[PDB]
Design a protein around this ligand. Structure first.
Ligand SMILES: O=C(O)C1=NO[C@H]2CN[C@H](C(=O)O)[C@@H]12
Ligand SMILES: [Zn+2]
Ligand SMILES: [Zn+2]
Ligand SMILES: [Zn+2]
Length: 254
């Protein structure tokens, strides 16, 4: 019976600082796909909220002893009621927090330079001249680290051997792809956002897996199912479609 604490994280085009000449404060600072989603959900469910950025700026990963960080940890410690962000639904996280039904589907894939013979992840694993990596303590890093597939196990060996291969966030990864001979293992949504704005980059191959983003809540929260119902309502009303198209408009690359 009070406002909800919504934890999220700066990530284009999901959550961003609004551009304005006036000094903005509070929730009015933020814009993006997940901000629109949060507004729709708050309207359907009828609750007010306060948006807070994660301290460590990470999504969530487990260390050796099993301790979590990032938004996942924020939910575990009950520091936030909802995690409204591109939080990837993974079976590993499902045992620590609860996810709503997905509001967007995606998969792991490769971001790399255009015009290059490379066309798959195995091409990255079978050579060592072209460096590759992923975001630190993310769903992708956990995917390669806990993968039992031979190729992905070798790739995880390569990423883990180079401390510079794992980047802090998508930003550093994209810059690294632009400056060095480096391919970035990331999620297909971000790739789609980038390749429509940067015509020299492209996606290599298809989706290495298939999963979705969901709203995170502490385990056993009564708002998980309510948010699922709201997401289903928005899908029937076709609003997630027009939101996605709203924030994924591309300048266009010929
Ligand atoms: O791990 C990745 O490839 C990711 N890219 O951006 C973030 C979106 N969700 C993933 C997560 O929940 O960790 C992060
Ligand atoms: Zn209405
Ligand atoms: Zn709680
Ligand atoms: Zn459309």
């Amino acid at each position: 019976n009070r406002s909800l604490i919504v934890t999220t994280l700066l990530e284009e085009p999901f959550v961003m600082f609004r551009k304005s000449d006036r000094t903005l404060y509070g929730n009015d600072r933020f814009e993006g796909y997940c901000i629109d989603l949060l507004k729709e959900l708050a309207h359907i469910l009828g609750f007010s909220y306060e948006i807070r950025l994660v301290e460590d700026g990470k999504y969530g990963a487990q260390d050796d002893k099993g301790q979590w960080n990032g938004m996942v940890k924020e939910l575990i410690d009950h520091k936030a009621d909802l995690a409204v962000a591109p939080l990837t639904i993974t079976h590993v996280r499902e045992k620590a927090i609860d996810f709503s039904k997905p509001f967007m589907t995606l998969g792991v894939s490769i971001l790399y330079r255009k015009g290059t013979p490379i066309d798959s992840a195995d091409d990255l694993a079978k050579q060592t001249k072209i460096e590759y990596g992923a975001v630190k303590d993310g769903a992708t890093m956990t995917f390669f680290k806990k993968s039992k597939i031979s190729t992905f196990e070798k790739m995880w060996a390569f990423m883990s051997s180079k401390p510079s291969a794992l980047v802090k966030n998508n930003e550093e990864g994209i810059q690294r792809t632009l400056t060095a001979d480096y391919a970035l293992l990331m999620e297909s949504t971000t790739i789609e956002y980038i390749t429509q704005r940067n015509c020299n980059l492209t996606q290599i191959g298809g989706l290495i897996d298939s999963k979705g983003y969901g709203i995170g809540t502490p385990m056993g929260s009564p708002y998980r199912d309510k948010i699922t119902i709201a997401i289903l309502q928005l899908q029937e009303e076709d609003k997630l479609h027009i939101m996605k198209e709203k924030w994924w408009r591309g300048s266009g690359c010929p």
